[PDB]
Amino acid sequence: VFSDFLLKDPPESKYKGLRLELAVDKLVSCIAVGLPLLLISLAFAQEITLGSQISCFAPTSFSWRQAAYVDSFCWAAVPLWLHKFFPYILLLVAVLLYLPNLFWRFTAAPHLSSDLKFVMEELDKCYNRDIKDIKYPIVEQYLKTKNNSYGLIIKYLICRVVTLIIVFTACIYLGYYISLFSLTDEFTCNIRTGILRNDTALPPLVQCKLIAVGVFRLLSYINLIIYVLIMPFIIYAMLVPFRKTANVLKVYEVLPTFSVQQAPSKTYDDHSLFLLFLEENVSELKSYKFLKVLENIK
């Protein structure tokens, strides 16, 4: 009947902590954000301890400031900018990896939270009414409405694709850096450009060794290992229809007011993602344990 649709008695803070993000996605994002931040914090601290990036052997005739000038000249411009922009690139990739979390929180979190709250409220009310009667399937209709939408799934896929693309780009950059800075970390520098061509009082070439190359190599190796370890998790999370989902509704047709589920399908609609979130958050539902034990009774 049209008597259960009243909403004059809504819960205040009954749920208080609904999980709006999947556990594996949260873990992957947390790792991929924390590791670069900590590693470049370590790099900044280590070079602050060191105080320089490149060391060049200047002739004894040169004074202190002439040696400083040649050091600065050789530090500015085989691709050399890879070693110079490594921490900035790591910050950029860390910020880009943190961005999808903000996008998901700002574009899809409130609607998903409201839908989950409504669905579990309806489930609990229907279970209580049915268990009181034994001493209308609103949830089924809401899921049927969700069966044709495409917004939340598109947002989730966009977040996962952006994260995967950023991770792959970072992996490519780190591998290229590791391959390039492997033979040596020293080169020759020519202090000749400009007016310095005329005078021959300066050596034609000076040996310049790049410092902290080994530390950067170790950080690149760690980042590459972590990223190639976490990439399969992102790939698996992308395949929403093929996730190992446990049908929470499979235990709910024991009640008389629930029909047997038919036509699973669940290719790339909001039904699949919503079912995944419902399975994740079913721990809060009070009636789930009662339904499970009642099913195990028979």
Add this chain to the structure above:
Amino acid sequence: VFSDFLLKDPPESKYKGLRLELAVDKLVSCIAVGLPLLLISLAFAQEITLGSQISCFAPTSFSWRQAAYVDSFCWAAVPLWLHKFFPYILLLVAVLLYLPNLFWRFTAAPHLSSDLKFVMEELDKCYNRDIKDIKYPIVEQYLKTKNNSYGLIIKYLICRVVTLIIVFTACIYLGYYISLFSLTDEFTCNIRTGILRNDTALPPLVQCKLIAVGVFRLLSYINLIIYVLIMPFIIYAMLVPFRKTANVLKVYEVLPTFSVQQAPSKTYDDHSLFLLFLEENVSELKSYKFLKVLENIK
């Protein structure tokens, strides 16, 4: 009848988190504020690691402090001030981009929040009364009153226009800097002005190379790419009437006390912006899901 106008029972904290800013606007503002701040923090840290901005080759006859004096002279005054004022300009544009958020929060947030609260309260009360009757359109009148106002839409347009203008000015400045500081980062410096003209003990010219030019170029490239990526979002947000709006009222004429909407129009009035905010915040409304499932029933 004139009996539903009582207000002796208002909710205390029923809503608790109404979204007073659009998701895309919030994301654009957050990105355009965070990126420059982090990038100039990186620039400050990097030069603190470096400790200098310009390196000049001084003659061996010069002492330490004479070289420091010529370094300072060449650092002070082809436009050179572009490289000197880059972080200050970035802070200025970041603060100017953060200003519209404060303007919107101080001038339009409370009134919009109150209007939204009143509208959803009226919607919920009318739905409950109608669903109780089946076992006066105050919202329509309030929207008709809002159909002639122009304040909130003017404030929103002012915020968007200011943000777009600041972003475009920053893009122009960054492009000009990138174009200018591309051929070289070194020049010649003349230590002659004042009493130094008479004595010939100083070289007529000295080579001075600007340091951190490549880092500034990379930061400018990143800022320009991000800003030209986010500008179309601002342009789309400016076109309020042409937004892909979903009529939340389209599901509300099922109730007998609701009339069919007519004359959409919605050119540049507060009705369009208020409808956009209502569609964004409809997730909090309890009756929206019930109306959706009832509409899907038929």
